[PDB]
């Protein structure tokens, strides 16, 4: 497809210099060597280069996500994108959300799975709310990549709530902290059977009961939805404490 393969590269380079990339999908789907030559520059990016990286990657990576390039070549794309995510791993909500799109689509790659997982685990441990805010995005797709994640960081997820327990009760970072925390637990709540013997009495009970004292109405809607699915199939003893107390 040398007649048209050059055509897609022409816009890819033209948009690449620009950072209107949507029309590429139509041109591509109506049918691409820029990946290695340009994505190396993405590895380099420096301060404002990341900002361009965050927006530019969100532009043309989205188009190739629709394209079968990932499912076809995967590895050379990863080779030119191996360390690109690390550049956008933090300091940009746009990049993390952009790669978040890649993350969920990546799993449906084992060498790649250990890469952002290895990058993620160190990022998660950093807490020991921007740090959590940016960190929570990557784990969202990683958790959604597979039905369950390893049990080791599940305790770390719990300890994250402990930080929220005191950080949240400040009485507009309160809204942002509230927004992120409810996002974290919902993905965690699906497994909730790490079998650590302390979830039932504190995590599901103290945190949720603590949340019932919270002032924001939106968060409650999530937990009741979480409890709503739980009854649909914890036992009634666990549900009872959650239900009557709320």
From Swiss-Prot:
It comes from the Eukaryota. Residues 1-235 are annotated as: Interaction with TP53. Coiled coil: none annotated. It is found in: Nucleus. Interacts with MYC, E2F1 and E2F4 transcription factors. Interacts directly with p53/TP53. Interacts with GCN5L2. Component of various HAT complexes. Component of the PCAF complex, at least composed of TADA2L/ADA2, SUPT3H, TADA3L/ADA3, TAF5L/PAF65-beta, TAF6L/PAF65-alpha, TAF10/TAFII30, TAF12/TAFII20, TAF9/TAFII31 and TRRAP. Component of the TFTC-HAT complex, at least composed of TAF5L, TAF6L, TADA3L, SUPT3H/SPT3, TAF2/TAFII150, TAF4/TAFII135, TAF5/TAFII100, GCN5L2/GCN5, TAF10 and TRRAP. The PI3K/PI4K domain is required for the recruitment of HAT complexes, and the MYC-dependent transactivation. Although it is strongly related to the PI3/PI4-kinase family, it lacks the typical motifs that constitute the catalytic site of PI3/PI4-kinase proteins, and lacks such activity. Belongs to the PI3/PI4-kinase family. TRA1 subfamily. Adapter protein, which is found in various multiprotein chromatin complexes with histone acetyltransferase activity (HAT), which gives a specific tag for epigenetic transcription activation. Component of the NuA4 histone acetyltransferase complex which is responsible for acetylation of nucleosomal histones H4 and H2A. Plays a central role in MYC transcription activation, and also participates in cell transformation by MYC. Required for p53/TP53-, E2F1- and E2F4-mediated transcription activation. It is linked to Developmental delay with or without dysmorphic facies and autism: An autosomal dominant neurodevelopmental disorder apparent from infancy or early childhood. Some patients present with intellectual disability and renal, cardiac, genitourinary systems, as well as structural brain abnormalities. In some cases, the phenotype is less severe, has no systemic involvement and is characterized by autism spectrum disorder and/or intellectual disability, sometimes associated with epilepsy. Affected individuals manifest variable dysmorphic features. This is Transformation/transcription domain-associated protein. The chain holds residues 2090 to 2399 of 3859 of the full protein.
